Amino acid sequence: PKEPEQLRKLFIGGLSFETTDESLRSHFEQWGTLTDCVVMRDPNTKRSRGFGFVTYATVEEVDAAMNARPHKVDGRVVEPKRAVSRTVKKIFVGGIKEDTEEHHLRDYFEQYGKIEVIEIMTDRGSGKKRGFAFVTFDDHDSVDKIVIQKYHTVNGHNCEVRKAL
Numbered sequence: 001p002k003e004p005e006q007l008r009k010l011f012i013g014g015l016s017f018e019t020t021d022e023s024l025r026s027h028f029e030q031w032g033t034l035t036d037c038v039v040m041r042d043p044n045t046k047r048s049r050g051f052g053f054v055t056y057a058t059v060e061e062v063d064a065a066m067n068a069r070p071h072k073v074d075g076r077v078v079e080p081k082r083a084v085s086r087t088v089k090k091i092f093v094g095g096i097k098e099d100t101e102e103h104h105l106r107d108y109f110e111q112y113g114k115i116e117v118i119e120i121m122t123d124r125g126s127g128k129k130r131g132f133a134f135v136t137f138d139d140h141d142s143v144d145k146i147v148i149q150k151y152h153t154v155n156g157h158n159c160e161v162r163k164a165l
């Protein structure tokens with residue numbers, strides 16, 4: 001069974017107006033099989049709108065494409081983003097109770113991306129742990145991967161994870 005197509009599609013912004021379906025495909029096929037690849041154009045002029053979409057056969061291929069950033073396509077560095085995830089670098093992690101420590105969160109989340117800050121929330125008056133935390137990554141794709149997952153188990157706790165603004 002295939003991963004849902006909606007989780008295999010990347011929005012590609014910042015395109016050169018000279019990029020075509022064919023040149024976009026030729027570039028992004030280097031990181032996987034593309035089941036679809038389109039440059040968005042004006043309906044009347046056919047002039048590029050400066051963005052497009054590529055759909056890979058597997059989520060692993062999406063990951064490979066994102067890990068190969070920065071992508072310079074037809075002379076311009078473009079901006080890939082997962083098209084469906086339901087742009088920030090920070091998550092709320094709730095439900096971690098009082099026994100979850102920084103190393104629990106780091107050991108778990110470091111496989112989603114490079115962590116820059118872990119903030120375990122404590123009570124302003126007592127210093128007791130409040131049972132939630134914030135994790136900041138160096139890049140948004142980590143967060144997009146994280147919030148797409150249905151489940152997050154950290155330190156034996158079933159955690160609620162959301163984007164933090």
Ligand SMILES: N[C@H]1CCN(S(=O)(=O)c2ccccc2)C1
Nearest residue numbers: 004006007084085086147148149
């Ligand atoms: N309930 C089904 C309906 C669609 N999917 S999905 O494509 O796996 C998905 C997962 C996470 C975020 C956005 C989409 C699950």
